[PDB]
Amino acid sequence: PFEVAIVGGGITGLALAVGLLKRNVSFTIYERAENFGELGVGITFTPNAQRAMEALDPCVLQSFTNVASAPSGGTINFVDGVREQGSEDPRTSTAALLFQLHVKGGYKACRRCDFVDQIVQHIPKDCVQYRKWLDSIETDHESGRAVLKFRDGEIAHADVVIGCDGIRSQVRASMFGTDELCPRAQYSHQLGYRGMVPLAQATAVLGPEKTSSAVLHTGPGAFVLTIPLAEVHAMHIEAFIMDKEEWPEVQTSSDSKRYVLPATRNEATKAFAEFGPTVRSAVSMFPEKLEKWAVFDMLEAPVPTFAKGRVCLAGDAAHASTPNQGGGAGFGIEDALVLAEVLAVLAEAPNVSGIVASEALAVYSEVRYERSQWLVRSSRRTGELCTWKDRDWGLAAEELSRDIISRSHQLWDHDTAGMVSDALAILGERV
Numbered sequence: 001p002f003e004v005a006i007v008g009g010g011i012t013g014l015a016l017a018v019g020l021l022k023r024n025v026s027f028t029i030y031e032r033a034e035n036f037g038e039l040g041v042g043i044t045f046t047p048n049a050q051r052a053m054e055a056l057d058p059c060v061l062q063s064f065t066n067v068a069s070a071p072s073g074g075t076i077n078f079v080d081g082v083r084e085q086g087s088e089d090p091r092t093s094t095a096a097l098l099f100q101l102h103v104k105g106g107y108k109a110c111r112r113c114d115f116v117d118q119i120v121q122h123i124p125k126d127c128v129q130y131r132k133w134l135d136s137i138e139t140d141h142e143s144g145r146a147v148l149k150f151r152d153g154e155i156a157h158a159d160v161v162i163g164c165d166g167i168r169s170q171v172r173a174s175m176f177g178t179d180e181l182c183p184r185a186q187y188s189h190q191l192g193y194r195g196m197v198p199l200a201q202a203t204a205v206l207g208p209e210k211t212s213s214a215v216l217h218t219g220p221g222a223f224v225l226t227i228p229l230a231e232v233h234a235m236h237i238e239a240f241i242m243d244k245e246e247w248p249e250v251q252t253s254s255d256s257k258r259y260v261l262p263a264t265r266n267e268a269t270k271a272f273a274e275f276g277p278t279v280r281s282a283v284s285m286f287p288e289k290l291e292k293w294a295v296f297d298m299l300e301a302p303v304p305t306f307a308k309g310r311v312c313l314a315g316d317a318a319h320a321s322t323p324n325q326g327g328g329a330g331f332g333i334e335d336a337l338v339l340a341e342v343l344a345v346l347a348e349a350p351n352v353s354g355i356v357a358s359e360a361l362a363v364y365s366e367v368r369y370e371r372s373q374w375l376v377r378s379s380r381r382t383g384e385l386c387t388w389k390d391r392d393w394g395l396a397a398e399e400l401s402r403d404i405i406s407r408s409h410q411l412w413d414h415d416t417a418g419m420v421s422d423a424l425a426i427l428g429e430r431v
Ligand SMILES: Cc1cc2nc3c(=O)[nH]c(=O)nc-3n(C[C@H](O)[C@H](O)[C@H](O)COP(=O)(O)OP(=O)(O)OC[C@H]3O[C@@H](n4cnc5c(N)ncnc54)[C@H](O)[C@@H]3O)c2cc1C
Pocket: 007, 008, 009, 010, 011, 012, 013, 030, 031, 032, 033, 036, 041, 042, 043, 044, 112, 132, 133, 134, 135, 164, 165, 166, 167, 168, 169, 170, 171, 255, 256, 259, 260, 293, 314, 315, 316, 317, 323, 326, 327, 328, 329, 332
């Protein structure tokens, strides 16, 4: 009977796991770490991701809502962060509004560790094998089933292998290799500086007009998001600075060590010196010492497909993205939903051949591949729009609004139900 191996207990892998559990599909999660750690990064999930969470199972969405914070007002105001008018005190200034982005079906943010902790409560402990660092995959000569080989020297068998193992996926290496020309994530030239302050502090400094909703402050070479989270009485400040430099290469198993460097507030101060009072004040609210996150994506070196034989990729393993149109983790949840649904059809059969397993994964890839590639490219472009890379969009508000509203519609307002039904229709025709 049909066994799914999930490699990696990140958001993608855990979401899939709950999906399979609720559909009575046999699986095991293989996780290299001793536990799921404590990475507390804020991830914003968009309406499409929330629908996918619910379709996986109500408890996946519940796990998220249990820990997520809604911003005070639900529209994102795009402003020109340079041409703020009226005063040098943000409390008395007028924001230079470009356009308002209304989200249909809500966005919320959570700490990654909080959501993981929630989802993990719905997965039996025996379904997770820790200290299982996937190193290679072979085919069983006798059975033709997949053979996972771990760094500890042990093996395991499965009918399908789902690489949910993140931006530096070993499953991806198994499928396509890891030479200099191989598919991989590379630096997107975007550096993130993040901080949380009391909402009362932000209001004191900026005035309640500027803390009453999310605001994305656009400008030359850099942008800031100020996101009021009234239910934890916090203001989240996120600054992204565009960096034409390459990112210093470090050889390390740790993504934190690979993608993060110490910084000072001065780097942000300098980056936003030509911006208006609101942005300068927001950046001033950072700690003096902080970290900078180098954002990597798979724009330049994508994978050619998400499936090959009995093996496939989901989440950051398949399509690590910039977060400029919401966290890529959300589209990992879409991936997990399609997989959960297709794998459940296979699990219902008494015997599943290698051929049929491979065809099923191919259907998953056909459904997700181009939409995923578009996420990576569109999110990159959104960052270029917000940092005025090729145009001063402060002078082209209506053109900017049409571009961002359209890209957001394509990404966020997707027919999640239709996606799954399409996958299953195609699967039914092909097997
Ligand atoms: C420092 C840092 C800051 C970030 N900040 C943001 C942010 O601000 N916003 C945002 O949207 N996203 C952010 N992210 C990314 C976010 O964490 C992921 O996009 C999200 O978790 C979805 O990734 P995933 O589930 O596909 O894979 P991951 O979260 O990478 O999970 C992969 C899992 O697989 C495991 N694994 C890896 N290789 C193997 C192997 N060979 N065998 C077994 N297990 C393996 C890992 O231990 C991990 O548990 C950040 C990431 C890092 C590292």
